[PDB]
Design a binder for this molecule. Structure first.
Ligand SMILES: Nc1ccc2cc3ccc(N)cc3nc2c1
Ligand SMILES: Nc1ccc2cc3ccc(N)cc3nc2c1
Ligand SMILES: Nc1ccc2cc3ccc(N)cc3nc2c1
Ligand SMILES: [Zn+2]
Length: 308
């Protein structure tokens, strides 16, 4: 049969005698590009993916992936063909990835997602992610790449990745309320719902954000932003990478990034019965940790401030 999602099969195949070179639009047996080949006896009955190019396919594809972008399922299949060949060790019970093709950012992403409460909207993500959590994460990875519109081998940012991915989860009952106090301009409160309710960029410390954090006011001058209320299952605090101390028990996990713009390397840190650094397939444990951190994730429930 022919498919776009592998749940819905259309045996509009030529199963017993084709032999015009895969005149089915682009085709893909098990994620290998087979567009330009005539069929090999032992094919009849296996399932080939094809690009959604009639009204009926474009629907099922949209319902499954939650985009209609045509190049999507191409870029997906492209990436799958590589990520199928990466290895996915469990480390301390989490699915990670053996380094290949600058995949460090994807490893870190993957590791964080297994540690954070999300529900993805597109069935494809929900599906893929279950498999990932279970150890076989080639699809999940291929999808993530297609969704962020990056190709295997191209360098990636973990914050940018999560950001895209959160576009596709159910965060709508997530709420953040901020107050900005200016000496001359007085106060100014702000409510954020959805993705922007869970992400801050400028400080790593959640404590510091509750205590208050100096920012330039819109008049130019000296103000304090603080978190008045938070309702979400986690928060993600980010900044440009800087030497930072992670203390046990006080965050859930974090991504560090050492290197520079052209060459660098992400590792994942997670606070358990000790601090575990997971660096693709590698694992080390220490009681201290200081290092160039870029993103920290905290478990949240509901928080309200007590600042008068
Ligand atoms: N992995 C990396 C590496 C360098 C980075 C430099 C940055 C500078 C400004 C900003 N707002 C975010 C950044 N994030 C980075 C993330
Ligand atoms: N893997 C990498 C390497 C360099 C990077 C440099 C950055 C500069 C600004 C920004 N906002 C994000 C960045 N992310 C990076 C991610
Ligand atoms: N300071 C640095 C700079 C670049 C780096 C590039 C890497 C690539 C793969 C890998 N497994 C580890 C790396 N560590 C780096 C450490
Ligand atoms: Zn002001």
């Amino acid at each position: 049969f022919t498919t776009v999602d592998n749940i819905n099969l259309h045996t509009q195949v030529v199963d017993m005698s084709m032999t015009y070179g895969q005149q089915f639009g682009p085709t893909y047996l098990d994620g290998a590009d087979v567009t330009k080949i005539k069929p090999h006896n032992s094919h009849e009955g296996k399932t080939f993916y094809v690009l959604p190019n009639d009204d009926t396919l474009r629907v099922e594809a949209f319902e499954y992936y939650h985009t209609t972008d045509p190049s999507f399922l191409g870029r997906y299949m492209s990436a799958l063909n590589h990520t199928k060949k990466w290895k996915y060790p469990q480390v301390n019970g989490l699915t990670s990835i053996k380094w290949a093709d600058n995949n460090c950012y994807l490893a870190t992403a993957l590791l964080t997602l297994q540690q954070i409460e999300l529900k993805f909207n597109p069935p494809a993500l929900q599906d893929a992610y279950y498999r990932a959590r279970a150890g076989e994460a080639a699809n999940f990875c291929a999808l993530i790449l297609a969704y962020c519109n990056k190709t295997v081998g191209e360098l990636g940012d973990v914050r940018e990745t999560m950001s895209y991915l959160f576009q596709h989860a159910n965060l709508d009952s997530c709420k953040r309320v901020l107050n900005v106090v200016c000496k001359t301009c007085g106060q100014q409160q702000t409510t954020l719902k959805g993705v922007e309710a869970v992400m801050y960029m400028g400080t790593l410390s959640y404590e510091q954000f509750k205590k208050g954090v100096q920012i330039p006011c819109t008049c130019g001058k000296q103000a304090t932003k603080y978190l008045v209320q938070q309702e979400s299952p986690f928060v993600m605090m980010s900044a440009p990478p800087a030497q930072y101390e992670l203390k046990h028990g006080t965050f859930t996990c974090a991504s560090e990034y050492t290197g520079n713009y052209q060459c660098g390397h992400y590792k994942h840190i997670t606070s358990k019965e000790t601090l575990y650094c997971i660096d693709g397939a590698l694992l080390t444990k220490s009681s201290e940790y200081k290092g160039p951190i870029t993103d920290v994730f905290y478990k949240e429930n509901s928080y309200t401030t007590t600042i008068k």
